[PDB]
RNA sequence: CCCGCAGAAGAAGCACCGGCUAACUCCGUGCCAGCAGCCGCGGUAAUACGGAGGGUGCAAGCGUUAAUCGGAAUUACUGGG
RNA sequence: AAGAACCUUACCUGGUCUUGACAUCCACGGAAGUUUUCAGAGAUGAGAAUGUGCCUUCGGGAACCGUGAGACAGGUGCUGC
């Protein structure tokens, strides 16, 4: 009896899923297609193609060979454990532990590769949550959702910084922006962008009347201080002005917002870190470009990046979550992962939806 | 004019030669025409069994 | 913003079955 | 242009025997008949105002095997003719050929009476006629052609027709296989379970 | 149009089923999909939506739309205020 | 809440068992019960002394313990709209 073998059983079935993700058949089919095209006598005569054919080769060789490394590797680890239990070699028991873990460390190498983290997915990011309509019901949902995310990253260890927070009227905000410092911080949060539906009996009306509130959240990364493509001039606009009341221990003890707009395509960012006007406008233009950066990536998806124009515009990830409090049923509209624990996911038990969003993102 | 697309899920695009059938919905303001699913270019619905003459599905060939 | 000020995303109020604003003339069926 | 389905399920919707399955065994001798006509038929219906006139009309059509396009055409001639339009409808449905053959006992069912007519085995007035809608003229003869002489149904049905009421406006000759159509049938002389007045009100809606 | 030659062998689909208007209750969805002629149905316990079984109405036709008239004594001379 | 130091305590952290803390049904063996030691925060886990009573369904019922196959048990989990 060995629970390590019970993990070898678990890792192998997961490996079948890891093979089930990448379409392991077509991986070996395409890799031989790069092989046949390099036999072509004009490899040296097509230089740019040659560096590209090697690029198509080397990118798959780090995956297909690893997939075959996990194939023949696991079969030997399947041998080294069962030989150890049936012969009682204490070192063979000790070595098989390192033999199983390294395969998971290859599964961990596939983990970031399956996540296909590119541009700024390994970097920190910013949040942007807007309140819906209907007075106090919307701002509470703005608040309760935001303060769930604030209690979320603290459990994961991501440093949180409220860049800007604009309180609506009665217990809640209308817009908020939070900087999330962390490794792969954009990677764990990118897929949460969209509109989040709240369904509950409102506490604001006598009787009952289950009310449906809406609120959206927008996650845009940190663009490495410069994208390397500055589209600055672009009808720039500064509007720096005093904010609500600095009452007692109000946010950052600043009340000095820097409202900056990007008139073409209508992008609006703002910052409320410090009293130094020149400091905030420096930080706000950083996120203005980042918000402009996510606009540039959506255009690729708008053509032929990941939409698959088959019949029509296959997408519209606006309604991505539904939070029904009085039925205790949280449903994700992108995968269908459901959970019957409201206060747990109101505390930050969102890993079940991250893996759900990791699949289609 | 603007017309309503019947059935569950459509296969239309920026340019498609459809067929317009009269009929008001009284639920959308201004829509006073329906679109025949299964006509000229607008195809019939998918996986339909009860009322398939409406929405142009032929018949289960099994 | 504009992707939230779409006329879809509006606060939806439900007609409760009993209480304030509960009366129905005939209801879903009128079997006599 | 025919029913072609379970026979006595039609009688179950009515709750009475419509004689369209009759040989010897009365009403299945068993499970359910003159009762629940479907899955939810154990639940009694409410029989609304349209349905009372409807089931009255449907009962008459299930008897003679006439479709709605055709039965309405009998109603046109029944209404335009003189006298009682409620009475003339049962007159024209009686003069229909397959009824006449069924009243002879030549066939044991109105369906079987069509089987003999359609397969050119009956010579009305000496002439072979395969029209089930043949309105039989008064003071006429109906006869079975020789190819259907003792052909295992005529003998079996005519002996079965001994428990009938032997309709008074006719003269069948059991043993010469030839019938004789006497006068127009009187209203009071037929089945009389049919509320003929509910039919005329339905088409006059 | 008659006569003769076979094993019933070649010949059944369509709309509808909350009320008006004949005919139901179970799954799947969950103010989201969709239905509609009108009143209005769908908020995780639907007879109105989508399938299944069972019925109804018609039947080589059945529905939908367009159009005229009728119900319209809601242009009323017959026949209103 | 007619009374939170453990208990209550349903929550938190760590340590653990999973037809289970609790009930009936099946199979096999073992009367129950009592004492004492070690590791350990404890739960539990691992040993050692000890007893075998009532009828004769005499090849066991009535009692009690342990290990499994399941039927289920369990829920201070959601909905007072
Ligand atoms: Mg015809
Ligand atoms: Mg009814
Ligand atoms: Mg239905
Ligand atoms: Mg059916
Ligand atoms: Mg009109
Ligand atoms: Mg008029
Ligand atoms: Mg008037
Ligand atoms: Mg635990
Ligand atoms: Mg229970
Ligand atoms: Mg309970």
Joined tokens for residue D98: 């397959």
Helix (H) or strand (E) holding D140: strand D140-144
User: Which chains are adjacent to chain D, needing at least 3 Cβ pairs under 8 Å?
Assistant: none
**B chain contacts of residue A312, beta-carbon cutoff 8 Å:** 10-13
* Phi and psi, residue B29, nearest 5°: -75, 115
CB atoms within 10 A of CB D194: 18
Q: Which CATH class is domain D7-93+190-204?
A: mainly alpha
Helix (H) or strand (E) holding D147: none
What DSSP designation does D47 have?
A: -
Yes or no: say if A139 and A169 are a contact pair by the CB < 8 Å rule. yes
- In CATH, the architecture of D94-180 is Roll (3.10)
CA gap D205, D203 in Å, rounded: 5
Q: How far is CA D182 from CA A177, D109, D117, D138, D141, in A?
A: 102, 21, 20, 6, 9
CA gap A128, A139 in Å, rounded: 14
The 3-class SS string of chain A reads CCHHHHHHHHHHHHHHHHHHHHCHHHHHHHHHHHHHHHHCCCCCCCHHHHHHHHHHHHHHHHHHHHHHHHHHHHHHHHHHHHHHHCCCCHHHHHHHHHHHHHHHHHHHHHHHHHCCCCCCCCCCEEEEEEECCCCHHHHHHHHHHHHHHHHHHHHHCCEEEEEEEEECCCCCEEEEEEEEECCCCCCCCHHHCEEEEEEEECCCCCCCCEEEEEEEEEEEECCCCCCCCCCCCCCEEECCEECCCCCCCCHHHCCEECCEEECCCCEEECCCCCCCHHHHHHHHHHHHHHHHHHHHHHHHHHHCCCCCCCCCCCCCCCEEEEEECCCCEEEECCCCCEECCHHHHCCCCCHHHHHHHHHCC
- Report residues 7-46 of D contacting strand E, contact meaning Cβ closer than 7 Å: 9-10, 13, 37-40, 43, 45-46
Contacts of D117 (CB under 8 A, 6+ apart): D97, D98, D101, D129, D130, D131, D132, D134
Yes or no: say if A199 and A322 are a contact pair by the CB < 8 Å rule. yes
This structure's resolution (angstroms)?
A: 3.2
Ligand 6 centroid from CA D69, angstroms: 30
For residue D170, give the 3-state DSSP assignment: strand
User: A-contacting residues of B 1-20, CB under 8 Å?
Assistant: 10-13
C3 touches chain A (CB under 8 A): yes
Q: How far is the CA of B23 from the C1' of E48 (A)?
A: 20
Ligand 8 centroid from CA A195, angstroms: 35
Cβ < 7 Å from nucleic strand F: A 201, 207-210, 326-328, 340; C 16-19
CA gap A317, A191 in Å, rounded: 10
Backbone torsion region of residue A41, taken as left when φ is above 0, otherwise alpha when ψ lies between -120 and 50, otherwise beta: alpha
- Report residues 20-49 of B contacting strand E, contact meaning Cβ closer than 7 Å: 21-27, 34, 47-49
* Phi and psi, residue A106, nearest 5°: -85, -35
Give the strands of the sheet with A267-269, arranged side by side: A236-238, A260-262, A267-269
Q: How far is the CA of D128 from the C1' of F18 (A)?
A: 88
What are the residue boundaries of the structural domains of chain D, listed by start?
A: 7-93+190-204, 94-180
State how beta strands A125-131 and A173-181 pair.
antiparallel
What DSSP designation does D161 have?
A: G
CA gap A269, A288 in Å, rounded: 6
Q: How far is A273 from chain C (nearest CA, A)?
A: 23
**C-alpha radius of gyration, chain B, whole number:** 12
Helix (H) or strand (E) holding D117: helix D110-118
Ligand 7 centroid from CA C25, angstroms: 28
Please tell me whether any atom of strand E lies within 7 Å of the Cβ of C30.
yes
Burial class (CB within 10 angstroms; exposed 0-12, middle 13-18, buried 19+) of A139 = buried
CA gap A109, A206 in Å, rounded: 56
Joined tokens for residue A170: 């009665």
Helix (H) or strand (E) holding C12: strand C12-13
Q: Where are the beta strands (DSSP E) in chain B?
A: 4-5, 20-22, 33-35
Burial class (CB within 10 angstroms; exposed 0-12, middle 13-18, buried 19+) of B11 = middle
Q: What is the dihedral of CA B13, B15, B16, B21, to 10 degrees?
A: 100
């Amino acid at each position: 009896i060995n629970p390590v073998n019970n993990r070898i059983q678990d890792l192998t079935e997961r490996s079948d899923v890891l093979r089930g993700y990448l379409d392991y058949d077509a991986k070996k089919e395409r890799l031989e297609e790069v092989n046949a095209e390099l036999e072509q006598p004009d490899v040296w005569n097509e230089p740019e193609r040659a560096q590209a054919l090697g690029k198509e080769r080397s990118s798959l060789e780090a995956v297909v060979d690893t997939l075959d490394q996990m194939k023949q590797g696991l079969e030997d680890v399947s041998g080294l454990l069962e030989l150890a239990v049936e012969a009682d070699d204490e070192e063979t028991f000790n070595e098989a532990v390192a033999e199983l873990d390294a395969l998971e460390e290859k599964l961990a190498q596939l983990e970031f590769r399956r996540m296909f983290s590119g541009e700024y997915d390994s970097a920190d990011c910013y949040l942007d949550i807007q309140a819906g309509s209907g007075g106090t019901e919307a701002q509470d949902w703005a608040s309760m959702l935001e303060r769930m995310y604030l209690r979320w990253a603290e459990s994961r260890g991501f440093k949180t910084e409220i860049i800007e927070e604009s309180e609506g009227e009665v217990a809640g905000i209308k817009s908020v922006t939070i900087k999330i410092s962390g490794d792969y911080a954009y990677g764990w949060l990118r897929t949460e962008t969209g509109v989040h539906r709240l369904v509950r009996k409102s506490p604001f009306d006598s009787g009952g009347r289950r009310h449906t509130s809406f609120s959206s959240a927008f996650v845009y990364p940190e663009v490495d201080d410069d994208i390397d493509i500055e589209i600055n001039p672009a009808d720039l606009r500064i509007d720096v002005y005093r904010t609500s009341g600095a009452g007692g221990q109000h946010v950052n003890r600043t009340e000095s917002a820097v409202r900056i707009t990007h008139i073409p395509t209508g992008i609006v960012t703002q910052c409320q870190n410090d009293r130094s006007q020149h400091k905030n406008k420096d930080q706000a233009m950083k996120q203005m470009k980042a918000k402009l950066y996510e606009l540039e990536m959506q255009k690729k998806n708008a053509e032929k990046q990941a939409m698959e124009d088959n019949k029509s515009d296959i997408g519209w990830g606006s309604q991505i979550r539904s939070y029904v409090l009085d039925d205790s049923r949280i449903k994700d509209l992108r995968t269908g992962v459901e959970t019957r624990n409201t206060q747990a996911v109101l505390d930050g038990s969102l890993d079940q939806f991250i893996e759900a969003s990791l699949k289609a993102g | 004019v603007t017309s309503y697309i019947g059935g569950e899920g459509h296969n239309l695009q920026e340019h498609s030669v459809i067929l317009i059938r009269g009929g008001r919905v009284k639920d959308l303001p201004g829509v006073r025409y329906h679109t025949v699913r299964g006509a000229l270019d607008c195809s019939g619905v998918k996986d339909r069994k009860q009322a398939r003459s409406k929405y142009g599905v032929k018949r289960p060939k099994a | 913003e504009a992707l939230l000020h779409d006329p879809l995303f509006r606060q939806r109020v439900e007609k409760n079955k009993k209480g304030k604003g509960s009366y129905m003339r005939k209801g879903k069926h009128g079997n006599r | 242009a025919r029913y072609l389905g379970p026979k006595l399920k039609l009688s179950r919707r009515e709750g009475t025997d419509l004689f369209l399955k009759s040989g010897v065994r009365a009403i299945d001798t068993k499970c359910k008949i003159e009762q629940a006509p479907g899955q939810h038929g154990a639940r009694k219906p409410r029989l609304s105002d349209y349905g009372v006139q409807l089931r009255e009309k449907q009962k008459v059509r299930r008897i003679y095997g006439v479709l709605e396009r055709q039965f309405r055409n009998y109603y046109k001639e029944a209404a335009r003719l003189k006298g009682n339009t409620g009475e003339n409808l049962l007159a024209l449905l009686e003069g229909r050929l397959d009824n006449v053959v069924y009243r002879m006992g030549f066939g044991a069912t109105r369906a079987e009476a069509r089987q003999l007519v359609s397969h050119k085995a009956i010579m009305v007035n000496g002439r072979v006629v395969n029209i089930a809608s043949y309105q039989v003229s008064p003071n006429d003869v109906v006869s079975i052609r020789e190819k259907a002489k003792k052909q295992s149904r005529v003998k079996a049905a005519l002996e079965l027709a001994e428990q009938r009421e032997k309709p008074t406006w006719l003269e069948v000759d059991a043993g010469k296989m030839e019938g004789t159509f006497k006068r127009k049938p009187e209203r009071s002389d037929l089945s009389a379970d049919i509320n003929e007045h509910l039919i005329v009100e339905l088409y006059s809606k």
